[PDB]
Amino acid sequence: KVEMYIKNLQDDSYYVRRAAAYALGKIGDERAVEPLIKALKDEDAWVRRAAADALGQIGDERAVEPLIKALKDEDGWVRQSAAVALGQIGDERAVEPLIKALKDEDWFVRIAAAFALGEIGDERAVEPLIKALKDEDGWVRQSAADALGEIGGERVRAAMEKLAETGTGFARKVAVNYLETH
Amino acid sequence: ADPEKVEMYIKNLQDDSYYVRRAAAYALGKIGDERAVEPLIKALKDEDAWVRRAAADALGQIGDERAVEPLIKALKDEDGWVRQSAAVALGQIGDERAVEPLIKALKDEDWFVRIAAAFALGEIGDERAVEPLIKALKDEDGWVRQSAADALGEIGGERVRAAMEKLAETGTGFARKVAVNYLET
């Protein structure tokens, strides 16, 4: 029963809270939303990440600001799942925090931020995602390219024309392909 | 990803630009049209790690048995993240031929692969994973420790209960914590 789990989320055994979190997500009702938001502050990083992940699957906008704060979690993997969850939700309040996350320490979270930014589809990400095309990590470059395509639209096309004309390297290839394929 | 472009994407799996091959593999995964099965299997051999991974992930989603032997080979990829997707994919497909290879992936040098292998083994539910997973409770990584417990959970049954009984008696650390909890519940 979700209220058992909702209560389990406070158990002394991190092993039990871990199980609660993962569960409240697979079978998530709105009842689970507020408890899970509290679990984003759990001592155990696993619990945090399972909570971020659940809340994304639930889709309730109440989690938006609490997740935005998790984009600053000590653990890179929970930041990763926060970014993804924000993407899923996907409230436009996440946009600017997610754009800041494009410069995260961990490549795997920069990928998540680009992906989320693309899912949300707010053109504010266009310029930051273009800069992300010159990221030191080749897989986040890739994820920045994919996100731009997911966003689509006039500002992206315009930004791509710019790059096709005077840009270079991966960015140029991305832009030439973009307008080739539209 | 445009469902009406499958044939284009398939062609694109052989494009000169890794960028176009990546895009193609990823698209066929979202689609996900059974026509892409043998071409995605071919993409498991691409020079580019991103496209191999994209390919492994796509094959798992489609669920075609043909992808099993090739994904098994992919568990020996030099890139840990394609190994991870290969493991995940093999769990999704559920074909029992993956059980022994996934058992050996329990000892992968990369923690995130061990986690994927543990999870797949629990999804397949084959009981030869019980003792390997029990040993995995002693993994140096706390997260792969966790995934082996969850996996043993999903497998359940008499053999697992039996092994849990023993750990409650003589086990130590997290493995002990897990067994006594398995009993309590």
Task: Explain this structure.
The structure is a homodimer. With 182 residues, the first copy, chain A, is mainly alpha-helical. Chain A has one domain: Leucine-rich Repeat Variant, CATH 1.25.10. Chain A is 71% helix and 0% strand. Chain A has 12 helices and no strands. In chain A, helix 3 packs antiparallel against helix 4 and helix 6 runs parallel beside helix 8. The longest helix of chain A is centred in the first third of the chain and has 14 residues. The interface between A and B is medium-sized, with 15 and 16 residues.
Give a concise summary.
Chain A has one domain: Alpha Horseshoe (Leucine-rich Repeat Variant). The first copy, chain A, is mainly alpha-helical and 182 residues long.
Structural domains of chain A: how many: 1
E-strand count of chain A? 0
CATH superfamily of chain A: Leucine-rich Repeat Variant
Helix run count of chain A = 12
Distance between the termini of chain A: 50 Å
Relative strand content of chain A = under 5%
Q: Which percent bin holds the helix content of chain A?
A: over 70%
Derived from helix and strand composition plus strand pairing, the structural class of chain A reads: mainly alpha
Largest sheet of chain A: none
How are helices and strands ordered from N to C of chain A?
Answer: HHHHHHHHHHHH
Assembly of the depicted chains: homodimer
- CATH hierarchy class name of chain A: Mainly Alpha
